[PDB]
UniProtKB/Swiss-Prot annotation:
This is Group 10 secretory phospholipase A2. Its EC number is 3.1.1.4. Glycans are attached at residue 71. It catalyses: a 1,2-diacyl-sn-glycero-3-phosphocholine + H2O = a 1-acyl-sn-glycero-3-phosphocholine + a fatty acid + H(+); 1-hexadecanoyl-2-(9Z-octadecenoyl)-sn-glycero-3-phosphocholine + H2O = 1-hexadecanoyl-sn-glycero-3-phosphocholine + (9Z)-octadecenoate + H(+); 1-octadecanoyl-2-(5Z,8Z,11Z,14Z-eicosatetraenoyl)-sn-glycero-3-phosphocholine + H2O = 1-octadecanoyl-sn-glycero-3-phosphocholine + (5Z,8Z,11Z,14Z)-eicosatetraenoate + H(+); 1,2-dihexadecanoyl-sn-glycero-3-phosphocholine + H2O = 1-hexadecanoyl-sn-glycero-3-phosphocholine + hexadecanoate + H(+). The lineage of its organism: Eukaryota, Metazoa, Chordata, Craniata, Vertebrata. It comes from the Eukaryota. The chain holds residues 43 to 164 of 165 of the full protein. Keywords: Calcium, Cleavage on pair of basic residues, Cytoplasmic vesicle, Disulfide bond, Glycoprotein, Hydrolase, Lipid metabolism, Lysosome, Metal-binding, Phospholipid metabolism, Secreted, Signal. Transmembrane segments: none annotated. It is an enzyme of class 3 (hydrolase). The keyword Disulfide bond applies. The gene is PLA2G10. Ca(2+) binds at residues 26, 28, 30, 47. One of its GO terms (cellular component) is lysosome. It comes from Homo sapiens.
Length: 122
């Protein structure tokens, strides 16, 4: 869920998970357009992962799961079902992705009107 998303992102990376609440075209609720930068690509990937999770019959925004932060790395589990596994994998992946990026302050609170209606495929 959102709680774990914030936690996992905070665990791995160097910045507040708040830094991704409204960034570029994809970091934040929904998203469309051409990704602005590396961070935005990570969020596009993550949106795709959550879509796949929803298609698999999971609730990515709400479902709780267990995980651990060890040496600024996410370890997933124990998992009670496939949805918990899938969601942790999505969040672990975005956390890892974002940790390897440089932050571009200019894309924080980027205007949605600059984001094109069409997006790269998942
Ligand atoms: N892939 C993303 O957009 C995304 C990346 C990210 C990173 C940290 C984060 O931490 C926070 F919650 F503290 F900001 C939140 C993050 N989001 C996010 C924000 C709102 C909704 C959704 C659901 C997915 C969606 O509808 O697009 C994801
Ligand atoms: Ca998004």
């Amino acid at each position: 869920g959102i709680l774990e998303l914030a936690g996992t992102v905070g665990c791995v990376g160097p910045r507040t998970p708040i830094a991704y609440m409204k960034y570029g075209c994809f970091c934040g609720l929904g998203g469309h357009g051409q990704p602005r930068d590396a961070i935005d690509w990570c969020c596009h990937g993550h949106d795709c992962c959550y879509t796949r999770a929803e298609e698999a019959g999971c609730s990515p925004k709400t479902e709780r799961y267990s995980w651990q932060c060890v040496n600024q790395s996410v370890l997933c589990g124990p998992a009670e079902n496939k949805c918990q596994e899938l969601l942790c994998k999505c969040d672990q992946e975005i956390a890892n992705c974002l940790a390897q990026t440089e932050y571009n302050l200019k894309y924080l609170f980027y205007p949605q009107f600059l984001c094109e209606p069409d997006s790269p495929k998942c």
